[PDB]
Amino acid sequence: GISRDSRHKRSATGAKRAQFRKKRKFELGRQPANTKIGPKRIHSVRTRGGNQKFRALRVETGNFSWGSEGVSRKTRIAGVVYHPSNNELVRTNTLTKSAVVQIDATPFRQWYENHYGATLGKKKGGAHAAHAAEVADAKRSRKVERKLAARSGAAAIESAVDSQFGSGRLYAVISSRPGQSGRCDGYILEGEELAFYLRRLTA
Amino acid sequence: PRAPRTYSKTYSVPKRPYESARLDAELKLAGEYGLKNKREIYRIGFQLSKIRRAARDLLTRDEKDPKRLFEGNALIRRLVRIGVLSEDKMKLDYVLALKPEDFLERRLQTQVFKLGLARSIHHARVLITQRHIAVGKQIVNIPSFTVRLDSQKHIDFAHNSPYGGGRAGRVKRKNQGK
Amino acid sequence: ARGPKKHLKRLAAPSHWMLDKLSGTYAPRPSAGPHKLRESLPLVVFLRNRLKYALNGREVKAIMMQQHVQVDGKVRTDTTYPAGFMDVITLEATNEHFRLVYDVKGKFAVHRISAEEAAYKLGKVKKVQLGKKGVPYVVTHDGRTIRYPDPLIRANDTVKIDLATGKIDDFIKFDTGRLVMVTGGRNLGRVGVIVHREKHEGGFDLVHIKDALENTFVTRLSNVFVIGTEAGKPWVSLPKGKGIKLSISEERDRRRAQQG
RNA sequence: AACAUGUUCUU
RNA sequence: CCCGUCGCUACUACCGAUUGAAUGGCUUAGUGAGGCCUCCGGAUUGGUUUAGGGAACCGAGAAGCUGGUCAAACUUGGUCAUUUAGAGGAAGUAAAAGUCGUAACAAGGUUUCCGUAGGUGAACCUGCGGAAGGAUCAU
RNA sequence: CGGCACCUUACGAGAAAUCAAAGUCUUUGGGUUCUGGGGGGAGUAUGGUCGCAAGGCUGAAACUUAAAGGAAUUGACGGAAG
RNA sequence: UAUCUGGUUGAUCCUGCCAGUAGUCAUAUGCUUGUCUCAAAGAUUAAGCCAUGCAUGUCUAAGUAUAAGCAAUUUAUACAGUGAAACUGCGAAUGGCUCAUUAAAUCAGUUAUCGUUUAUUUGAUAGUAUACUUGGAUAACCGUGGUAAUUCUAGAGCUAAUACAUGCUUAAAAUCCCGACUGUUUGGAAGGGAUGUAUUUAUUAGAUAAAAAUUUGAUGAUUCAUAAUAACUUUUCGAAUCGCAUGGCCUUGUGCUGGCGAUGGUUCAUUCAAAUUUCUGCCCUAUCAACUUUCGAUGGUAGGAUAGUGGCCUACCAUGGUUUCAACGGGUAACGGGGAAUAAGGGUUCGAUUCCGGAGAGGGAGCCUGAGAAACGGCUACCACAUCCAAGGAAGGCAGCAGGCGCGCAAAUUACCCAAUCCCGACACGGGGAGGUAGUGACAAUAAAUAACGAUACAGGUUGUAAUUGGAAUGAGUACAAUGUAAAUACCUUAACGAGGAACAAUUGGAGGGCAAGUCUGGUGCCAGCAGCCGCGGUAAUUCCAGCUCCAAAAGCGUAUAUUAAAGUUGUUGCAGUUAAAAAGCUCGUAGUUGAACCUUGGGCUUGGCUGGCCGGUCCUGGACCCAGCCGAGCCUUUCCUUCUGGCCAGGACUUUUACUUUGAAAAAAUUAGAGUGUUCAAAGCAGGCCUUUGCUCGAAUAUAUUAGCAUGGAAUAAUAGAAUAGGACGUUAUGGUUCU
RNA sequence: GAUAAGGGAAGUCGGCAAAAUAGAUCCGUAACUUCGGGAUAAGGAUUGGCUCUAAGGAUCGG
């Protein structure tokens, strides 16, 4: 089938090599998963040594990390907005490693509000102001108020990340390999990398 | 499969087939030791030749040399033991003087002839072949069987020989009765 | 070649087994086990070609099927068990004990030992590192693993192990002045004492040694088996010769002298 | 001035 | 002593119309078995298990279907290599005593030879320049 | 000092003729390029290449054969000389 | 044994080849062939085609037994013994065969995995926050069958597990997050969660340059090991299994308990493997000089795929990569190597083939299973062959063993057996054409019969004598018996036999030279024939055809082809080039090869060893002293010979690069050289020898390997670098300034 | 002026007449040669619609 041998290629001098042996099973390849966004379907692959791989054919949700805050939650993936290696993966929403994706920003919002007491979005419309007034006037016992005070000072976050919380979708980078592990995991874009990808996107 | 068995040859024919001098000398040796053919002369030439190649190389080395001393002394002792060399000639330089007339003395054909067991050396050969000879307590039927000094004393008629005590043989058992 | 070889040709068997050429096509193939294939002596060789306790391999099978034969005290029935360096072989039915030790000529001599002696062995430290749950262990040259060793032990060190509980009795630090015994190379079977060690980063470290008779001989570090703490005191019994090489003329002189 | 040629094979 | 043409015979190789022939390899293009992956499908089957008659909704799932992927093989064309038929043509070699002359070896009866160019049954002859390996180491 | 040569010798070289190099080479090594490997077939055939052409350069094989060849010696012969 | 001889001429000296000569574990062939030990054997042409039979199976007390199988009544009315079938597990990826493909490929030595997978083995190693033990399938089996036919199977009825899927039995204290109330300058607290180990991602430990105003592993080196936090997962597994003994405790309940074990299980280690991988090294060819890059060629970034690295593949981008130091292309009557033949030395030639590595199973490709195969005594498909058929269909792969056809110069029996060697399996027991034993076997190798001894008159100068007179001896072979052996055979041992023409009858080539041995007789008459070469033969042939004699080797001798020496006729050692073959018509010129001399030489002092003699001291050998000789060290001479710390070793800071040579580590057996051994000798083998034992015993040496790589001493020879617009060297504890840690 | 099963020049003096080919892009292209050619040699592949992506500019303002 698909093969990874180096014998079928030309030498560095440019000579066309002669056939040495028939194809060997220890040098096979297989078909790309071409993971998509949809209801979960994961197929096992029996590999060498009796080990197992997982071809994520379709995935709904991934475990994403807010690196600075030291917390990660099992959000859900909206779409693919940028791929460094091929615009055909973004145009068809194909999930591989290093794909720039938008995830649901909601669970990180809940964690922010529960572990701090402040809110994000910062937009001053009707629903945004209503939710802000609700959050600022929540019911907090004195010990939880003091532990949140011990969590104060560093409450504010970088202006680029929280600005996007108006839309309920953040920007992330896939760090797992869905075709190899069956997981579609990543981390929130932050700082210099975030500015780079925003520059690439808005353009 | 199973490992090969090592083997070799024990003679080498001369490069010149028709040399009158060499041919005459070989016939003289054959007559003086009652040999079957020239290959027996060839075998002595061959073995003495490899002895002299090794021993020449040793003599080309220095004394006290472990290669030299060890191999030369081993060769000297293996030569003295068989009766090719004598008692006063353990030097490694007398071996070069050795001659095909030497190695041919030690054969059981010659030894049986020399100590009265046979009327002629041809008789000695036909006695050894016809199994009437004994070396110590081992009966020997090979004419080229080399006798050391230890078995020089121990050559006699076979313990069960017609000539060494026992039923005589067919011609006797068919003629004496009548 | 599609998979693991299960036969060993006779000519491909290690020479230090002294296997005669013309017996047959094949040789015992030592099983996977504690020692390397090449640097071990399978039990069938030990119990047939050395002790002559058996006329053939079928009788070797019969002998070991009756719980007679033991390695490191434990009972083994694998006819091709890779017994190796420092292994202790117990034979209670015969009331006899052995220890595989390199005679100076380069082989495994038939080294008889006592029952009190046949209850321990020695082990070189391959490496020291932390396992799961942070528990430290050291790996020995016989595939034994021991947890919780002395926090000072490092690689190239010899440890004493009891053959019953698998516990470590006492050990040795690797430094200049230690009695050792070469594990490979041309200097096989000979017993020396450390003189100096030269450290080549990225390469193979070199160690300088000296026999009881004054002879300086160098060897790869990976062939050095510490056997004692000082000169003259091994932690096991030594074969007939005490591991000192004698030249061929010397041995010939001794043979003539002994025989008269 | 002219002047071409000499069967085969040896002892 | 000896040269070439010519005559009889035998053997070897070469050129040669036949867009000759045959065999083996590589290859464009066209078609393409089959497996594997994927996609739906849903003969059949047990119930995530529950319903007065059983109505939902769980699981397992064969044939087949979609799209890929690896790609045998066939046709066509191309190219490479190796054998090989062939009217006729032009050589070479061999083979006691065939024909024609006598070119060379003597100043070989025109000294011989080299390069080049013409001519001629054949050896060869002639022109121009060269060599002595000359028939002159010299006036 | 450089050059074109010559005469004698032969230590030396060589099969000899001869050679001041053709010496300093079995007592075999200063540096370096090119060429040959019995006689023919044959500098032919074929492919390539240069040339207007004539040709030049590169360049086989099958097959055939016991010599061909070099230098000198004695004779013989010469439309050679004395 | 470092060797030559015949042939050009009337004669000579040369060049030069032809011929002769000897070897070949090198093949065929002719003739001949008594004995023993050892032994290759359808590679060469056709990796051509194959009838038939066999070559892979496997059960212990410890997985599953209502054989309606066998035995008997027994510590067993759930079974318990033996033992078919079948399920389950394991093996079938080893072995054996072959050499077609293959020329930086394979392979060899040498590396790397801080770049991966690994059944098994052996070590370890998990108390994780209905349980007197859960379900439902099917085989085996009885029963109806269908097809011409295959190791084809369908309906129906049972029934099991270490098969399949499910599921609890549980410690101890402790940490963390959330936290209704509550104390009140910041405490307590009810109640909820996570605790293991696997999986994925992200983020933090993983430190160790020396004094002022705390614990921490390894490496040459890491993002290593290990640990923590937050989360994640079509939830991995933290035992619903089995045999024999049945003990101890009573709070006497079919009570609580507990001995050797079988099997299994996560992770790590190890072992057996694998897959990649560094450096150097291959035969002929230019009538192959440019090659590679469309469609990956060289590289970069990102991904996908893999067990994992990597253009392995994709997307975008850059325009690179190899080459006269021979790339690329073509040939190979090319698998590589260990090795083999010949060998003064240097070389030449060969290696299908007993060991190692690779590759293949008619050709191609694609897969399943499994730890491991791109497996062919596995599947699928095509091509080519090919079997059966009732014409609808079915079944194949001898380059396994033996055997057939074909091919050719060219190669053996359809035999016996697991007894040795080892391999596999659940296994002490089963299986093994692997392997071992016989048949065929002048491939090669070792030893070695075809005769001998006496007497008459003879013959002769003390025996060496030409014939025929006798007594004996013997194994070639046939055969009582044992041995040998799995059973045999054969050898070895041995009753009765077994020689005068001992007819129990030796052959193959020769007799001009080279080259050893005739000018004897007939035949022919340049014919027939011989002759490697020169030649013989035309009516007196030492050469043909024949008879006699002789020569050489002999159980072996001759022929053909190839190759080695001879060949200094391939020449590095080591050829030749005026005329024998052969200096380019002549200069220029790049690659290549090769290139003048020169830089620490001398001198002195102290001292180790081993060489000869003087002491001589002699038991071959022994000590201080003198003499000299060789191999060495250390100091001093303007003085090289790294440099600090602790304080002659052991941790830091720096080093101009090479060639060459020394020494060493390591380098598979077999083969080679070589030490020990009455295999009766020997070739061989690695054994064997001892007062005769209930034991004792030396062994299974040693060198050779080294082009490349690694470590190491030396500094001649031959290179390389340096300070010239000074951008140079030193300032140790020079001085000042700017940065870091 | 058209079309025609199967065959495909057997028709005819003769393929007369008709048919077949045809634009463009990419690939590939022999002998021979006056070196200019031969050449569109020969012989292959692609081509619609729609929705997108990329490249190639001008003028002002330090």
Ligand SMILES: CN[C@@H]1[C@@H](O)[C@@H](O[C@@H]2[C@@H](O)[C@H](O[C@H]3O[C@H]([C@@H](C)O)[C@@H](O)[C@H](O)[C@H]3N)[C@@H](N)C[C@H]2N)OC[C@]1(C)O
């Ligand atoms: C018409 N010209 C011719 C030319 O063609 C050639 O002639 C050859 C001639 O040499 C050949 O001759 C060849 O063969 C013959 C044959 C008897 O063996 C012999 O003479 C000789 O071996 C050889 N030369 C001949 N066979 C053909 C002619 N055309 O040479 C001679 C010539 C006269 O110039």
Ligand SMILES: CN[C@@H]1[C@@H](O)[C@@H](O[C@@H]2[C@@H](O)[C@H](O[C@H]3O[C@H]([C@@H](C)O)[C@@H](O)[C@H](O)[C@H]3N)[C@@H](N)C[C@H]2N)OC[C@]1(C)O
């Ligand atoms: C010397 N030149 C000669 C020329 O003279 C000629 O010679 C022939 C020669 O060939 C003839 O000879 C030839 O032919 C005869 C026979 C077939 O006739 C053969 O037996 C003989 O072997 C063969 N050489 C000979 N018989 C006469 C000469 N003149 O042959 C041609 C030639 C070679 O050019």
